[PDB]
Each structure stands twice: as structure tokens, then as C-alpha cells.
Amino acid sequence: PEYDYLFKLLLIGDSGVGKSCLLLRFADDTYTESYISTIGVDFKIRTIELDGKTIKLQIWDTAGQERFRTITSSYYRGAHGIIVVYDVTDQESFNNVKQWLQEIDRYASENVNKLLVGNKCDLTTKKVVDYTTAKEFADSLGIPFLETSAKNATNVEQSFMTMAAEIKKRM
């Protein structure tokens, strides 16, 4: 075509953990604080090269506040992969990963790809979720995991490529 592969990605997680920030960093290599919140669902496209193959990613960026969940869930079953984000400075956000994974269990395709991302890892002072606490949890579910900083670009690119490769492998 004009792309070798077409993958659909979903960002999922509590409000304000940084899902839009991560997406805008991956799609435009910018970080700004001059955007209103995500109302409903946002959408960005980016192409990557992997194993020489051109891959077109279609990333849906959901709103994470509770009331939005029912609208949000309608987008799961389309996705090739779902990224669950939490804020590493915010304990309650990590605690909620369990439910989000239940949402994936309830709504997404039975063998969708799951990645876990711990954002705002540049705020080291206020950091409350340690790598080992998260890794071990992710390990227990066969889920890949990275800490990232949309602000510093730290592991943002790596995240999506890992997700991509993981889907690629699956087909």
C-alpha cells in the first residue's frame, strides 16, 4: 500500500497521569502545557519503521475520569494494543491499574496486546511508585513495562515501538 502494517492503539488510565502528553510527544516530539483536557476521545497518527517494515499506528487517546468510562469502553474492542498509564507520583493512579486491566478483560479483544507505562518519572522528589513495585506486578501478568517522561522524552519512543513489535510478532 503506502504502509506495510496498520495497527490500532489505545491509551487508557486515570485522568492526568499524562496520556495525552505521551501521545503528543510520540507524534510531534513536543511537550506543552497549553491544552485543555481530553473530552471523550482524541486521535493521532504516526508512522514508524520496524524490521525494515513501515508501520502506521492509529492511536486513540481516551478521557480517564470515571463518568467517561462507558463512552471510552466502546473503543477497546477495535484495538491491536492497549497502553495502561499511571502517574508514578500518584499512588491512587497505580492502584487503579487493576481495574483498567479488568476493563481490557471486559471490553478489548481476547488476545489484545497490553503495555504498562509509569509516567512523570522525571519528578523524582514526589515519586511514590518504585520501579520494582510496578515491574513485579507487570511481570506477574506477562505485561511489558516502562517508566516514562513525556516532558523529557525519556522512554516515550521506546514504549510505542515495544508495543508495535509486540503486535507485529503476534501477526
Binding site: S15, S37, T38, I39, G40, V41, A63, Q65, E66, R67, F68, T70, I71, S74
Partner: peptide
């Protein structure tokens, strides 16, 4: 943000 939920329910 969720003020917008009644309306999107009809339109998203």
C-alpha cells in the same frame, strides 16, 4: 470535563 458526558453519549 464530564459535564460533556450527557451530550457525547448521544454523539461521540
Amino acid at each position: 470535563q464530564s459535564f460533556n458526558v450527557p451530550a457525547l453519549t448521544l454523539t461521540h
